[PDB]
Amino acid sequence: IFAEDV
Amino acid sequence: IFAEDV
Amino acid sequence: IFAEDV
Amino acid sequence: IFAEDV
Amino acid sequence: IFAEDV
Amino acid sequence: IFAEDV
């Protein structure tokens, strides 16, 4: 899993 | 931005 | 708003 | 998996 | 079961 | 905002 909020 | 690889 | 169940 | 971004 | 109220 | 996942 890769996840981000940017 | 929200992004994911799952 | 981003919401999920996976 | 639960996820939420707000 | 998913419920989302906005 | 309400999210419920069951």
- Give the chain C residue whose CA is nearest to the CA of F6: C5
- Which chain F residues are Cβ-neighbours of D2 within 8 angstroms? 3, 5
Q: Up-side HSE of residue D5: CA atoms within 13 Å toward CB? A: 9
Rounded to whole angstroms, the Cα distance separating F2 from A1 reads 25
Q: Up-side HSE of residue F4: CA atoms within 13 Å toward CB? A: 5
Rounded to whole angstroms, the Cα distance separating C6 from A1 reads 12
Reading the block at residue F1, the tokens are: 């905002």
Chain A neighbors (3+ CB pairs < 8 Å): B, D
Experimental approach taken: X-ray
